[PDB]
Amino acid sequence: PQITLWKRPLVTIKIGGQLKEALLDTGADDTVLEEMNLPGRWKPKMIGGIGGFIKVRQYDQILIEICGHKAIGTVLVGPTPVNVIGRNLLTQIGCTLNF
Amino acid sequence: PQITLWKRPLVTIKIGGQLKEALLDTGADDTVLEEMNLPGRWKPKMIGGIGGFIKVRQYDQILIEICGHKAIGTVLVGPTPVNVIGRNLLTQIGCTLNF
Numbered sequence: 005p006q007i008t009l010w011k012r013p014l015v016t017i018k019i020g021g022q023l024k025e026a027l028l029d030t031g032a033d034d035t036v037l038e039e040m041n042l043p044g045r046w047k048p049k050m051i052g053g054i055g056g057f058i059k060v061r062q063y064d065q066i067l068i069e070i071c072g073h074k075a076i077g078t079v080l081v082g083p084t085p086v087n088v089i090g091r092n093l094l095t096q097i098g099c100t101l102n103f
Numbered sequence: 104p105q106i107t108l109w110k111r112p113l114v115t116i117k118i119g120g121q122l123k124e125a126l127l128d129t130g131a132d133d134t135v136l137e138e139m140n141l142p143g144r145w146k147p148k149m150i151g152g153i154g155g156f157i158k159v160r161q162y163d164q165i166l167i168e169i170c171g172h173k174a175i176g177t178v179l180v181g182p183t184p185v186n187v188i189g190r191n192l193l194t195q196i197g198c199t200l201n202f
């Protein structure tokens with residue numbers, strides 16, 4: 005589809021057998037999702053933006069479905085105020101910016 | 104243009120008569136630039152990101168050209184980690200997400 009940017013580009017995703025809402029975010033290198041207790045191992049990480057850094061848990065090779073488009077890659081989990089789908093997954097669903 | 108997302112979507116912008124590089128950021132409601140001198144009145148404002156809130160100077164109705172496309176809108180100036188073009192200006196240049 006084509007998504008205009010009058011409002012936040014929010015979509016439904018499926019991860020860990022759960023549905024959540026997330027932003028298609030071209031400004032995020034990697035995907036960052038709200039606290040969820042995923043199975044498996046992880047590596048600590050700190051990621052920075054406006055206001056500073058938050059601590060997150062890095063999970064690799066996580067399956068995510070975005071608007072029925074399947075992808076698999078790194079997901080960072082932590083106390084983020086917003087779920088963002090980053091470029092690591094946006095590329096996998098064929099997402100471009102166009103003007 | 105059509106812009107893929109294997110790399111950061113960085114473009115050249117012109118603001119206040121000077122060229123800069125900035126990130127097309129669909130996850131940003133607003134446009135936030137790193138500290139700089141800008142001709143125009145401004146007002147103190149607060150904006151929140153992944154890591155908390157920062158103080159910015161709000162410049163309204165600023166001319167800014169993004170990748171050859173003209174816009175006139177609000178530009179926030181402050182200690183953002185990187186120059187970002189948010190949705191307030193992405194809409195003006197006719198930018199959409201497509202997949």
Ligand SMILES: CCC(CC)CN(C[C@@H](O)[C@H](Cc1ccccc1)NC(=O)O[C@H]1CO[C@H]2OCC[C@H]21)S(=O)(=O)c1ccc(CO)cc1
Nearest residue numbers: 031032033034051052053054086130131132133151152153
């Ligand atoms: C370094 C460039 C960006 C910061 C500038 C990076 N961000 C993605 C960005 O889209 C965030 C994503 C975002 C969206 C809502 C709330 C927090 C973070 N948007 C954002 O900060 O926008 C602010 C300006 O306009 C306003 O409207 C939203 C907040 C304000 S981020 O969330 O901090 C971020 C995301 C993933 C990683 C790991 O790669 C590291 C940082």
